[PDB]
Amino acid sequence: GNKITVEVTVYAAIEKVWKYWNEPAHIMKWCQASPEWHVPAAQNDLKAGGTFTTTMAAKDGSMSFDFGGVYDQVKTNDLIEYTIGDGRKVRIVFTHTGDTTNIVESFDPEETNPRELQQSGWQAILNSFKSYTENNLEHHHHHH
Known part of the structure:
Protein backbone atom coordinates (compact mmCIF):
# COMPACT_ATOMS: atom_id res chain seq x y z
CA GLY A 1 0.00 0.00 0.00
CA ASN A 2 2.13 2.86 1.33
CA LYS A 3 5.17 0.96 0.01
CA ILE A 4 4.67 2.62 -3.39
CA THR A 5 7.06 1.12 -5.96
CA VAL A 6 7.84 2.33 -9.50
CA GLU A 7 10.13 1.12 -12.29
CA VAL A 8 11.45 2.33 -15.68
CA THR A 9 13.17 0.61 -18.64
CA VAL A 10 16.33 2.45 -19.80
CA TYR A 11 18.36 1.21 -22.82
CA ALA A 12 21.93 2.10 -21.85
CA ALA A 13 25.02 0.57 -20.20
CA ILE A 14 24.85 0.63 -16.39
CA GLU A 15 28.09 2.64 -16.39
CA LYS A 16 26.60 5.30 -18.73
CA VAL A 17 23.37 5.98 -16.78
CA TRP A 18 25.28 5.85 -13.47
CA LYS A 19 27.27 8.92 -14.54
CA TYR A 20 24.20 10.75 -15.90
CA LYS A 89 13.17 5.86 3.73
CA VAL A 90 14.32 6.01 0.08
CA ARG A 91 16.54 3.35 -1.58
CA ILE A 92 17.53 3.00 -5.27
CA VAL A 93 18.30 -0.60 -6.36
CA PHE A 94 20.22 -1.01 -9.64
CA THR A 95 19.36 -4.10 -11.75
CA HIS A 96 19.61 -4.99 -15.47
CA THR A 97 18.01 -7.89 -17.35
CA GLY A 98 20.80 -7.92 -19.93
CA ASP A 99 20.46 -5.40 -22.78
CA THR A 100 18.24 -3.02 -20.73
CA THR A 101 18.82 -1.33 -17.34
CA ASN A 102 15.95 -1.27 -14.80
CA ILE A 103 15.89 1.47 -12.12
CA VAL A 104 13.79 0.62 -9.01
CA GLU A 105 13.02 3.19 -6.25
CA SER A 106 10.61 2.89 -3.28
CA PHE A 107 9.01 5.95 -1.59
CA ASP A 108 7.39 6.58 1.83
CA PRO A 109 4.04 8.51 1.29
CA GLU A 110 2.36 10.60 4.00
CA GLU A 111 -0.92 9.60 5.66
CA THR A 112 -2.40 13.12 5.38
CA ASN A 113 -1.90 13.37 1.59
CA PRO A 114 -3.62 10.76 -0.75
CA ARG A 115 -1.29 8.12 -2.26
CA GLU A 116 -3.05 8.15 -5.66
CA LEU A 117 -1.95 11.73 -6.49
CA GLN A 118 1.73 11.23 -5.56
CA GLN A 119 1.76 7.65 -6.91
CA SER A 120 0.87 8.89 -10.40
CA GLY A 121 3.38 11.72 -9.91
CA TRP A 122 6.44 9.45 -9.61
CA GLN A 123 5.18 7.36 -12.54
CA ALA A 124 4.47 10.47 -14.64
CA ILE A 125 8.05 11.81 -14.49
CA LEU A 126 9.41 8.30 -15.11
CA ASN A 127 7.29 8.05 -18.29
CA SER A 128 9.15 11.10 -19.66
CA PHE A 129 12.27 8.92 -20.00
CA LYS A 130 10.39 6.48 -22.26
CA SER A 131 9.07 9.34 -24.40
CA TYR A 132 12.61 10.72 -24.72
CA THR A 133 13.95 7.42 -26.12
CA GLU A 134 10.99 7.26 -28.53
CA ASN A 135 12.82 10.13 -30.27
CA ASN A 136 14.44 7.32 -32.27
CA LEU A 137 11.63 7.94 -34.78
CA GLU A 138 12.58 4.97 -36.96
CA HIS A 139 13.00 2.84 -33.82
CA HIS A 140 14.42 0.28 -36.26
CA HIS A 141 16.10 -2.76 -34.68
CA HIS A 142 17.60 -6.08 -35.84
CA HIS A 143 15.39 -9.01 -34.75
CA HIS A 144 15.29 -8.09 -31.04
Missing part, protein backbone atom coordinates in the same frame (compact mmCIF):
# COMPACT_ATOMS: atom_id res chain seq x y z
CA TRP A 21 22.01 9.86 -12.92
CA ASN A 22 24.82 11.16 -10.63
CA GLU A 23 25.92 14.16 -12.74
CA PRO A 24 24.39 17.33 -11.02
CA ALA A 25 24.56 19.51 -14.14
CA HIS A 26 22.36 16.99 -15.96
CA ILE A 27 19.74 16.94 -13.17
CA MET A 28 19.57 20.76 -13.15
CA LYS A 29 18.50 20.43 -16.83
CA TRP A 30 15.43 18.18 -16.18
CA CYS A 31 15.03 18.70 -12.40
CA GLN A 32 11.42 17.87 -11.41
CA ALA A 33 10.79 17.77 -15.18
CA SER A 34 7.80 20.13 -14.64
CA PRO A 35 7.19 23.79 -15.86
CA GLU A 36 5.61 24.66 -12.47
CA TRP A 37 9.12 24.34 -10.97
CA HIS A 38 12.69 25.53 -11.62
CA VAL A 39 16.23 24.80 -10.34
CA PRO A 40 18.33 28.04 -9.98
CA ALA A 41 21.07 25.97 -8.29
CA ALA A 42 21.93 22.46 -7.07
CA GLN A 43 24.79 20.65 -5.29
CA ASN A 44 25.72 16.96 -4.98
CA ASP A 45 28.85 15.08 -3.80
CA LEU A 46 28.71 11.33 -4.48
CA LYS A 47 30.65 10.04 -1.46
CA ALA A 48 29.97 8.04 1.72
CA GLY A 49 29.39 10.24 4.79
CA GLY A 50 29.03 13.11 2.29
CA THR A 51 26.03 15.51 2.08
CA PHE A 52 24.09 17.28 -0.69
CA THR A 53 21.78 20.29 -1.18
CA THR A 54 19.24 20.90 -4.01
CA THR A 55 17.70 24.41 -4.29
CA MET A 56 14.31 24.43 -6.07
CA ALA A 57 11.25 26.73 -6.02
CA ALA A 58 7.96 27.23 -7.85
CA LYS A 59 8.17 29.37 -10.99
CA ASP A 60 5.79 31.90 -9.38
CA GLY A 61 8.05 31.71 -6.31
CA SER A 62 4.89 30.98 -4.32
CA MET A 63 6.50 27.89 -2.70
CA SER A 64 10.18 27.26 -1.86
CA PHE A 65 12.03 24.27 -0.37
CA ASP A 66 15.49 22.63 -0.23
CA PHE A 67 16.28 18.88 -0.06
CA GLY A 68 19.34 17.71 1.90
CA GLY A 69 20.67 14.64 3.69
CA VAL A 70 23.71 12.36 4.22
CA TYR A 71 24.73 9.20 2.31
CA ASP A 72 24.79 6.10 4.55
CA GLN A 73 26.72 4.02 1.98
CA VAL A 74 27.83 4.31 -1.68
CA LYS A 75 28.94 1.46 -4.02
CA THR A 76 29.44 1.69 -7.81
CA ASN A 77 26.67 -0.23 -9.64
CA ASP A 78 25.08 -1.75 -6.50
CA LEU A 79 22.99 0.34 -4.03
CA ILE A 80 22.54 4.10 -3.39
CA GLU A 81 20.60 5.48 -0.40
CA TYR A 82 20.61 8.40 2.06
CA THR A 83 18.96 9.43 5.35
CA ILE A 84 16.22 12.11 5.05
CA GLY A 85 15.66 14.69 7.81
CA ASP A 86 11.93 13.87 7.82
CA GLY A 87 13.03 10.30 8.67
CA ARG A 88 11.54 8.88 5.45
Whole structure:
Protein backbone atom coordinates (compact mmCIF):
# COMPACT_ATOMS: atom_id res chain seq x y z
CA GLY A 1 0.00 0.00 0.00
CA ASN A 2 2.13 2.86 1.33
CA LYS A 3 5.17 0.96 0.01
CA ILE A 4 4.67 2.62 -3.39
CA THR A 5 7.06 1.12 -5.96
CA VAL A 6 7.84 2.33 -9.50
CA GLU A 7 10.13 1.12 -12.29
CA VAL A 8 11.45 2.33 -15.68
CA THR A 9 13.17 0.61 -18.64
CA VAL A 10 16.33 2.45 -19.80
CA TYR A 11 18.36 1.21 -22.82
CA ALA A 12 21.93 2.10 -21.85
CA ALA A 13 25.02 0.57 -20.20
CA ILE A 14 24.85 0.63 -16.39
CA GLU A 15 28.09 2.64 -16.39
CA LYS A 16 26.60 5.30 -18.73
CA VAL A 17 23.37 5.98 -16.78
CA TRP A 18 25.28 5.85 -13.47
CA LYS A 19 27.27 8.92 -14.54
CA TYR A 20 24.20 10.75 -15.90
CA TRP A 21 22.01 9.86 -12.92
CA ASN A 22 24.82 11.16 -10.63
CA GLU A 23 25.92 14.16 -12.74
CA PRO A 24 24.39 17.33 -11.02
CA ALA A 25 24.56 19.51 -14.14
CA HIS A 26 22.36 16.99 -15.96
CA ILE A 27 19.74 16.94 -13.17
CA MET A 28 19.57 20.76 -13.15
CA LYS A 29 18.50 20.43 -16.83
CA TRP A 30 15.43 18.18 -16.18
CA CYS A 31 15.03 18.70 -12.40
CA GLN A 32 11.42 17.87 -11.41
CA ALA A 33 10.79 17.77 -15.18
CA SER A 34 7.80 20.13 -14.64
CA PRO A 35 7.19 23.79 -15.86
CA GLU A 36 5.61 24.66 -12.47
CA TRP A 37 9.12 24.34 -10.97
CA HIS A 38 12.69 25.53 -11.62
CA VAL A 39 16.23 24.80 -10.34
CA PRO A 40 18.33 28.04 -9.98
CA ALA A 41 21.07 25.97 -8.29
CA ALA A 42 21.93 22.46 -7.07
CA GLN A 43 24.79 20.65 -5.29
CA ASN A 44 25.72 16.96 -4.98
CA ASP A 45 28.85 15.08 -3.80
CA LEU A 46 28.71 11.33 -4.48
CA LYS A 47 30.65 10.04 -1.46
CA ALA A 48 29.97 8.04 1.72
CA GLY A 49 29.39 10.24 4.79
CA GLY A 50 29.03 13.11 2.29
CA THR A 51 26.03 15.51 2.08
CA PHE A 52 24.09 17.28 -0.69
CA THR A 53 21.78 20.29 -1.18
CA THR A 54 19.24 20.90 -4.01
CA THR A 55 17.70 24.41 -4.29
CA MET A 56 14.31 24.43 -6.07
CA ALA A 57 11.25 26.73 -6.02
CA ALA A 58 7.96 27.23 -7.85
CA LYS A 59 8.17 29.37 -10.99
CA ASP A 60 5.79 31.90 -9.38
CA GLY A 61 8.05 31.71 -6.31
CA SER A 62 4.89 30.98 -4.32
CA MET A 63 6.50 27.89 -2.70
CA SER A 64 10.18 27.26 -1.86
CA PHE A 65 12.03 24.27 -0.37
CA ASP A 66 15.49 22.63 -0.23
CA PHE A 67 16.28 18.88 -0.06
CA GLY A 68 19.34 17.71 1.90
CA GLY A 69 20.67 14.64 3.69
CA VAL A 70 23.71 12.36 4.22
CA TYR A 71 24.73 9.20 2.31
CA ASP A 72 24.79 6.10 4.55
CA GLN A 73 26.72 4.02 1.98
CA VAL A 74 27.83 4.31 -1.68
CA LYS A 75 28.94 1.46 -4.02
CA THR A 76 29.44 1.69 -7.81
CA ASN A 77 26.67 -0.23 -9.64
CA ASP A 78 25.08 -1.75 -6.50
CA LEU A 79 22.99 0.34 -4.03
CA ILE A 80 22.54 4.10 -3.39
CA GLU A 81 20.60 5.48 -0.40
CA TYR A 82 20.61 8.40 2.06
CA THR A 83 18.96 9.43 5.35
CA ILE A 84 16.22 12.11 5.05
CA GLY A 85 15.66 14.69 7.81
CA ASP A 86 11.93 13.87 7.82
CA GLY A 87 13.03 10.30 8.67
CA ARG A 88 11.54 8.88 5.45
CA LYS A 89 13.17 5.86 3.73
CA VAL A 90 14.32 6.01 0.08
CA ARG A 91 16.54 3.35 -1.58
CA ILE A 92 17.53 3.00 -5.27
CA VAL A 93 18.30 -0.60 -6.36
CA PHE A 94 20.22 -1.01 -9.64
CA THR A 95 19.36 -4.10 -11.75
CA HIS A 96 19.61 -4.99 -15.47
CA THR A 97 18.01 -7.89 -17.35
CA GLY A 98 20.80 -7.92 -19.93
CA ASP A 99 20.46 -5.40 -22.78
CA THR A 100 18.24 -3.02 -20.73
CA THR A 101 18.82 -1.33 -17.34
CA ASN A 102 15.95 -1.27 -14.80
CA ILE A 103 15.89 1.47 -12.12
CA VAL A 104 13.79 0.62 -9.01
CA GLU A 105 13.02 3.19 -6.25
CA SER A 106 10.61 2.89 -3.28
CA PHE A 107 9.01 5.95 -1.59
CA ASP A 108 7.39 6.58 1.83
CA PRO A 109 4.04 8.51 1.29
CA GLU A 110 2.36 10.60 4.00
CA GLU A 111 -0.92 9.60 5.66
CA THR A 112 -2.40 13.12 5.38
CA ASN A 113 -1.90 13.37 1.59
CA PRO A 114 -3.62 10.76 -0.75
CA ARG A 115 -1.29 8.12 -2.26
CA GLU A 116 -3.05 8.15 -5.66
CA LEU A 117 -1.95 11.73 -6.49
CA GLN A 118 1.73 11.23 -5.56
CA GLN A 119 1.76 7.65 -6.91
CA SER A 120 0.87 8.89 -10.40
CA GLY A 121 3.38 11.72 -9.91
CA TRP A 122 6.44 9.45 -9.61
CA GLN A 123 5.18 7.36 -12.54
CA ALA A 124 4.47 10.47 -14.64
CA ILE A 125 8.05 11.81 -14.49
CA LEU A 126 9.41 8.30 -15.11
CA ASN A 127 7.29 8.05 -18.29
CA SER A 128 9.15 11.10 -19.66
CA PHE A 129 12.27 8.92 -20.00
CA LYS A 130 10.39 6.48 -22.26
CA SER A 131 9.07 9.34 -24.40
CA TYR A 132 12.61 10.72 -24.72
CA THR A 133 13.95 7.42 -26.12
CA GLU A 134 10.99 7.26 -28.53
CA ASN A 135 12.82 10.13 -30.27
CA ASN A 136 14.44 7.32 -32.27
CA LEU A 137 11.63 7.94 -34.78
CA GLU A 138 12.58 4.97 -36.96
CA HIS A 139 13.00 2.84 -33.82
CA HIS A 140 14.42 0.28 -36.26
CA HIS A 141 16.10 -2.76 -34.68
CA HIS A 142 17.60 -6.08 -35.84
CA HIS A 143 15.39 -9.01 -34.75
CA HIS A 144 15.29 -8.09 -31.04
